[PDB]
Write a protein that binds this ligand. Structure first.
Ligand SMILES: OC[C@H]1O[C@@H](O[C@H]2[C@H](O[C@H]3[C@H](O[C@H]4[C@H](O[C@@H]5[C@@H](O)[C@H](O)[C@@H](CO)O[C@H]5O)O[C@H](CO)[C@@H](O)[C@@H]4O)O[C@H](CO)[C@@H](O)[C@@H]3O)O[C@H](CO)[C@@H](O)[C@@H]2O)[C@H](O)[C@@H](O)[C@@H]1O
Ligand SMILES: [Mg+2]
Length: 388
């Protein structure tokens, strides 16, 4: 009734729940945190919109902000965050702020950022002649194939078929804008088509697994390094340090390999107030509480997570820790996925087309024509909603 309901995701939800104890101690506001896996969170949010009942505070994946702003699910908090020492936009990376601001109105406060980088086994790269991480698409292909040639059930590089960012990241690296200046999808034009060919090359030549092997990060990257290279975010630094002691000093991260560029994705999460909340005041207090820079830095550093607030990167560990140095370097040019309200739907369509290619053996051009058409059809449906 007076309990503040907070919906949060994954491992970071534990830090939120723990920080919430002191908030309750200091205010007398009881907090209930529902911990939702990222794989289920989109559906949970759709259900909340359809029933107009949900939490008071919601942790929003950055890529879902356009969707849920457009759906009218997130409170416009522009006036409230403008007046705040700790939630004003000027504190946050411009890319992170782009995930919160639509048509001049602010719909959340950045909570953490992330970007994707290359994880690699330094010992195993050295053995196939790479003293440094692969720096180009050609090198990543070459190193991966040499690594897969260790033997039948040994690989070189992972492509996560459920990762929304992967095809879009590589596409931009090869000069695809993904949507052109007019908003027309261009997933069937040469830059993107060659991107998907390149990703499929690892599958077809046996250097990326073509099924889920069912190994944890420790078992695939650790030991003899069955999967000796992959792409992920800060959460994997923390996971590997905790779970793979056998490769201590035998792995590192590096910025992504380049094609025309090496741009990564900018993501993370924001805190937002659900528009139907009866406790908007207490929601805002919680957000402000959670935005205190020392409270933030404490859990961020402990988890190797990336702050969205700029001045946090002046902290000595963020400047000097090897993992943070690489994340900070990549963050410089990291861009959010297209900030469009059908993003998840489009990413899941990409996932199905990817599956058709890597598992079904579909032609990449034919499949990308099919995918692009699907995307244009979605966009036209939304257009028709805006034009009668
Ligand atoms: O897409 C919505 C939202 O996601 C935000 O990303 C979250 C991230 O979630 C991603 C999820 O990660 C789960 C992890 O999977 C591993 C991959 O991260 C890794 O790169 C890959 C290596 O090839 O191996 C996978 O196993 O598994 C953990 C359980 O063991 C989960 O705790 C973790 O959530 O991976 C999915 C695809 O496989 C992605 O769809 C999903 O987005 O989880 C992070 C940890 O909680 C979190 O820090 C991150 O913010 C993204 O930031 C945001 O911009 C998007 O809107
Ligand atoms: Mg092999």
């Amino acid at each position: 009734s007076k309990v503040l309901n907070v919906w949060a995701m994954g491992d970071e939800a534990k830090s939120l729940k723990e920080l919430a104890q002191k908030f309750t101690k200091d205010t007398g506001i009881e907090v209930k945190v529902q911990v939702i896996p990222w794989a289920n969170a989109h559906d949970k949010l759709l259900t909340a919109v359809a029933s107009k009942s949900g939490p008071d505070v919601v942790q929003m994946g950055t890529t879902w902000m356009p969707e849920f702003v457009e759906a009218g699910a997130l409170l416009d908090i522009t006036k409230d965050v403008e007046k705040s020492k700790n939630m004003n936009s000027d504190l946050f990376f411009p890319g992170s702020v782009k995930t919160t601001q639509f048509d001049g109105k602010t719909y959340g406060v950045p909570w953490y950022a992330e970007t994707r980088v290359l994880f690699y086994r330094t010992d195993l790269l050295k053995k196939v002649g790479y003293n440094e991480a692969p720096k180009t698409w050609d090198e990543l292909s070459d190193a991966a194939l040499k690594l897969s040639k260790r033997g039948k059930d040994m690989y070189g590089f992972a492509i996560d078929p459920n990762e929304q960012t992967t095809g879009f990241i590589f596409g931009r690296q090869n000069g695809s804008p993904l949507f052109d200046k007019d908003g027309t999808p261009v997933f069937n034009k040469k830059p993107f088509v060659d991107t998907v060919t390149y990703l499929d090359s690892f599958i077809k030549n046996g250097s990326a697994p073509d099924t889920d092997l069912g190994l944890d990060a420790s078992q695939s990257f650790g030991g003899d390094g069955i999967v000796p290279m992959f792409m992920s975010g800060p959460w994997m630094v923390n996971t590997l340090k905790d779970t793979a002691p056998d490769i201590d000093g035998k792995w590192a991260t590096a910025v992504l390999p380049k094609k025309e560029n090496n741009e990564s994705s900018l993501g993370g999460a924001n805190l937002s107030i659900f528009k139907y909340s009866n406790k908007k005041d207490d929601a805002l207090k919680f957000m402000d509480y959670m935005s205190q820079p020392d409270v933030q830095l404490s859990w961020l550093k402990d988890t190797n997570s990336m702050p969205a607030r700029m001045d946090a990167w002046e902290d000595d560990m963020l400047k000097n820790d090897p993992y943070y140095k690489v994340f900070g370097e990549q963050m410089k040019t990291a861009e959010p996925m297209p900030l469009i309200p059908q993003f998840e739907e489009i990413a899941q369509l990409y996932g199905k087309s990817w599956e058709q290619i890597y598992r079904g053996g579909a032609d990449v051009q034919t499949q990308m024509d099919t995918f692009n058409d699907q995307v244009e059809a979605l966009l036209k449906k939304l257009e028709h909603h805006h034009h009668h």
